[PDB]
Amino acid sequence: GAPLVTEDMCIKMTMEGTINGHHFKCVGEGEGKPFEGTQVEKIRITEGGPLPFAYDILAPCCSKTFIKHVSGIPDYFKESFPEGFTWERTQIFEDGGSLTIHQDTSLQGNNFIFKVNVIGANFPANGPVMQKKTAGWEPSVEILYPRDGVLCGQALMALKCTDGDHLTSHLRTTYRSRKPSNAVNMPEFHFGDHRIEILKAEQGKFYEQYESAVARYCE
Amino acid sequence: PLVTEDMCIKMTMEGTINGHHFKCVGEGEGKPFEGTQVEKIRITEGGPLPFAYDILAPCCSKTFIKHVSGIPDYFKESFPEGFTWERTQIFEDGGSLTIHQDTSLQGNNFIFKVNVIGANFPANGPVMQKKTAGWEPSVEILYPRDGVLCGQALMALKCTDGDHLTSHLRTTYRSRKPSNAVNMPEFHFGDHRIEILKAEQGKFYEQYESAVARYCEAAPSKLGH
Amino acid sequence: PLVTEDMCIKMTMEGTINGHHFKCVGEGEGKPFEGTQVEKIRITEGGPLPFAYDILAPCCSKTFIKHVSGIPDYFKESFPEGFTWERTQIFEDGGSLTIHQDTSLQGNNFIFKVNVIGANFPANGPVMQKKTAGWEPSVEILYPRDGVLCGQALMALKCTDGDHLTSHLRTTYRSRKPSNAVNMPEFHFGDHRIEILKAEQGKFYEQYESAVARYCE
Amino acid sequence: PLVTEDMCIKMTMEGTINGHHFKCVGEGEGKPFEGTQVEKIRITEGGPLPFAYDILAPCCSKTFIKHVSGIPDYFKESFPEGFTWERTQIFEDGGSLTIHQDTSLQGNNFIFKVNVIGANFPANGPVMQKKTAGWEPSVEILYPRDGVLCGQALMALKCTDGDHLTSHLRTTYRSRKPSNAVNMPEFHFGDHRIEILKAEQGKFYEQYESAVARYCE
Ligand SMILES: [Cl-]
Ligand SMILES: [Cl-]
Ligand SMILES: [Cl-]
Numbered sequence A: 001g002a003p004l005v006t007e008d009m010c011i012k013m014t015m016e017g018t019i020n021g022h023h024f025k026c027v028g029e030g031e032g033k034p035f036e037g038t039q040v041e042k043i044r045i046t047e048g049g050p051l052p053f054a055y056d057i058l059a060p061c062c063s064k065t066f067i068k069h070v071s072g073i074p075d076y077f078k079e080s081f082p083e084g085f086t087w088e089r090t091q092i093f094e095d096g097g098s099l100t101i102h103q104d105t106s107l108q109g110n111n112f113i114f115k116v117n118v119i120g121a122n123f124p125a126n127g128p129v130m131q132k133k134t135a136g137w138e139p140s141v142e143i144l145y146p147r148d149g150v151l152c153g154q155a156l157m158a159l160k161c162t163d164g165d166h167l168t169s170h171l172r173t174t175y176r177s178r179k180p181s182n183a184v185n186m187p188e189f190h191f192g193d194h195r196i197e198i199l200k201a202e203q204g205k206f207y208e209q210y211e212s213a214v215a216r217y218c219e
Numbered sequence B: 001p002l003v004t005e006d007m008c009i010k011m012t013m014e015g016t017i018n019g020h021h022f023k024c025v026g027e028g029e030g031k032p033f034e035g036t037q038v039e040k041i042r043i044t045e046g047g048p049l050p051f052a053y054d055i056l057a058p059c060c061s062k063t064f065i066k067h068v069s070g071i072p073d074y075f076k077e078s079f080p081e082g083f084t085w086e087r088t089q090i091f092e093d094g095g096s097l098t099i100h101q102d103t104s105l106q107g108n109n110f111i112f113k114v115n116v117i118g119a120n121f122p123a124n125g126p127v128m129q130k131k132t133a134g135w136e137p138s139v140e141i142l143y144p145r146d147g148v149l150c151g152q153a154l155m156a157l158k159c160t161d162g163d164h165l166t167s168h169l170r171t172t173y174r175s176r177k178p179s180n181a182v183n184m185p186e187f188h189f190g191d192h193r194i195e196i197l198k199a200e201q202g203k204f205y206e207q208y209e210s211a212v213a214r215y216c217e218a219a220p221s222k223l224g225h
Numbered sequence C, D: 001p002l003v004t005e006d007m008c009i010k011m012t013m014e015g016t017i018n019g020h021h022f023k024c025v026g027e028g029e030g031k032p033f034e035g036t037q038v039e040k041i042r043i044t045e046g047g048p049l050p051f052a053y054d055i056l057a058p059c060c061s062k063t064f065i066k067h068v069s070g071i072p073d074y075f076k077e078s079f080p081e082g083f084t085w086e087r088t089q090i091f092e093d094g095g096s097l098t099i100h101q102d103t104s105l106q107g108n109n110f111i112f113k114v115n116v117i118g119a120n121f122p123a124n125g126p127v128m129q130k131k132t133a134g135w136e137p138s139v140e141i142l143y144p145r146d147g148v149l150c151g152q153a154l155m156a157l158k159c160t161d162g163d164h165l166t167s168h169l170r171t172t173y174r175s176r177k178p179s180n181a182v183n184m185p186e187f188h189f190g191d192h193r194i195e196i197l198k199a200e201q202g203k204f205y206e207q208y209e210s211a212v213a214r215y216c217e
Helices: none
Strands: A009-019 A022-033 A038-047 A085-093 A098-108 A111-121 A134-137 A140-147 A150-161 A166-177 A190-202 A206-216 B007-017 B020-031 B036-045 B083-091 B096-106 B109-119 B132-135 B138-145 B148-159 B164-175 B188-200 B204-214 C007-017 C020-031 C036-045 C083-091 C096-106 C109-119 C132-135 C138-145 C148-159 C164-175 C188-200 C204-214 D007-017 D020-031 D036-045 D083-091 D096-106 D109-119 D132-135 D138-145 D148-159 D164-175 D188-198 D204-214
Touching: A009 A038, A085 B083, A085 B109, A098 B096, A098 B109, A111 B083, A111 B096, A111 B109, A111 B164, A134 A190, A140 C138, A140 C148, A140 C164, A150 A190, A150 C138, A150 C148, A166 B109, A166 C138, B007 B036, B132 B188, B138 D138, B138 D148, B138 D164, B148 B188, B148 D138, B148 D148, B164 D138, C007 C036, C083 D083, C083 D109, C096 D096, C096 D109, C109 D083, C109 D096, C109 D109, C109 D164, C132 C188, C138 C164, C148 C188, C164 D109, D007 D036, D132 D188, D148 D188
Parallel strands: A009 A111, B007 B109, C007 C109, D007 D109
Antiparallel strands: A009 A022, A022 A038, A038 A206, A085 A098, A085 A166, A098 A111, A134 A150, A140 A150, A140 A190, A150 A166, A190 A206, B007 B020, B020 B036, B036 B204, B083 B096, B083 B164, B096 B109, B132 B148, B138 B148, B138 B188, B148 B164, B188 B204, C007 C020, C020 C036, C036 C204, C083 C096, C083 C164, C096 C109, C132 C148, C138 C148, C138 C188, C148 C164, C188 C204, D007 D020, D020 D036, D036 D204, D083 D096, D083 D164, D096 D109, D132 D148, D138 D148, D138 D188, D148 D164, D188 D204
8 A cells, every 4th residue: 555654754752761860851853864864853851951971872762764775675664664663672881881772663644753761771980971971973783684573683883982982882672563474574684884973962952863874785 | 767677568660571561560568677578569551461470570679688797788778768770681592671660768668660671582582482480599799889889690580491591680779878878888699589479360470589688608708708 | 015915824723612622724815905815724633523613714814804995904014013813702692702813924924823712502502503504794893992903793693594693792903013103093894704615524614705994885 | 439538639721811821830739528629820831910810710620619408519420531611701891701621530639721711801901900809709500401510600800999890600511421320400509719818929829719509598
């Protein structure tokens, strides 16, 4: 039936959770080109601001429908609608900090609706995250592979620090399409290039966030 | 004294495991200083659970720990302010749990508020296939770091085939008392034994625990401790 | 200066994996600036291997990486001093590898000395049951830390049933060149593709690799 | 006999940690059934160590463990065949150790052969800066898996600033006895306490350990 993902679509996000005991909430509105793999989002901290932790760790928590797929690789996420999908992720930082995320992605007309829950634990008191000594993400590469009827992903991310060092993390994600399994055109092993740029940061409250993404094979 | 010989438990828990939302409510009682407690947990939403309940049991109570050898009770002494804690539990087969908990004191009742998110539990693993049979007793190591109490522990989940499914826990305990008033313990161990006494209708569970905070006693050292 | 368009490889490796001792010797060649190489490996002791050879392949060569976009070659520029590296590889099923490697240059030959210890590979896992079918291409992130070059990567071992067995690699690369003379690169990626050309009688293997150092393109 | 009340220890250890080659030899004695032992360790090569000796300490003895509660001693009952074990130790700051060990019996002497590879210890971390002050006592969990004995433990390294540096150990113990003659124990705990009694000139170390195998008491 009708194709539900358009050249131009918008984003509505609500995210709440707890990082090292600190409760917070934020809302996001954005837009992008799903098939060109580009998107931009404006995030407003609505509760718990100003954040006592670096916003940068929220960034990869704030969008798998906006990925350009090349080489005929099936789009597990775009093809999931109208049902949509959820995903679960644990991100383990090398200094002990850890993030676990549950996300819900649904489609409402021209708007992707994102619902995000986040719990963070054991971020070191004098680490770059809790001290806010971070300076954005390096581009990262995710490996995507099928397992037991759903799509799994793992990636390494490198958080830039204001002392010059990188703070790395390991991500494990399971993506769950709500589509009938037999109706799933599951992709094969492939890569996902993600580049996140925080265009603006204001008053520890307002953040403009840009991402370009591509699903591809090696070279 | 704010903590007495016999006290009661009121718990609310909400979370999502591998995409499945659930809520549960607990009521129980125990002897804080004898390090024993029992709680009745009802799954109020998302029941019957599509996963093994056993992984919720250690999410469902640090005030009921018997402290020996003069080890300060970071949890009992935190009141009336109380405390929070945060924890990530990594299972050897890829599954993971992250928990936030709030512990406060209302008269004779300890109030527990728990939020849980679980990810990447293997579809055919013991947890999602409900092939578990309770926990082995666990030893947590407790040590101070940056003004608060940290804890790490290995947990061994018994499987129905006779095997064990192990996991690694990292927890930060955060007392709400002013740092000036905190009486921080030194490095020590926490023995925890969990027993699920009842399961009824995949919706009602009875859970008992005993716990002791101690130093290493089996292999002694020339200067304490 | 010391690295030319065509060079050879002489490798010696010994180690123990899940209690099984082994030794092997390798001889190969490649084009350092085109980022390609091939090598013939013979299990000289402990053969036939009771484990999948596939896990040894990423242990058997950083001088054969094509560097684009002006990225300084930490490994090629390390000579004549050369370099060492240390790596731990953790498999998702509990198996783990730790490797020490020594790389030196004698005339036209790169000299590789490799030590490996493997622990806790599951008895019925793909590695010990030899149910593996080579590696997916992998991406390593390279970044400077405390005067030397660090590397992390995820690797995915293909299994005969179709599934993947993933692992996490953490590596520190140590140039023997004086710190003041080291031309440290910035954060970048490393694409590695490993193909096992031949695998005979659990003792004789041919191994090909193409590698590229690049930014996010 | 084969394990008597008073036996001796002969150890040889070799390895590399962050690229630094080292060798050390050990001589000691203890009471296997009282779970106590002492040992003198000499750094024979690579001295003085550029890293803290403390991380070598738990690499340097499963025979000297007092078994209470009727726990079968997997290690004592492994002789004359003896046993090996394999271990990976992951520190919270990125450093890692992987060890292969061989334990055999020669008359009144336990013979230990140890291979160690260490990777990615932070340049300014406690280990490489030698800011450690001995180990806290540890608890290992022991459980059977696929015909052999597995172990996991948390170890906490005391640091000079008061903090602790924790690590996670995964070990597989492999008895050389025939599977059919193996008396495998059930899930139990292992209490280990290590004390370094002397440590002259970064080349000589005296090391004491008491150990007990038990249930939860
Ligand atoms: Cl920030
Ligand atoms: Cl159940
Ligand atoms: Cl093979």
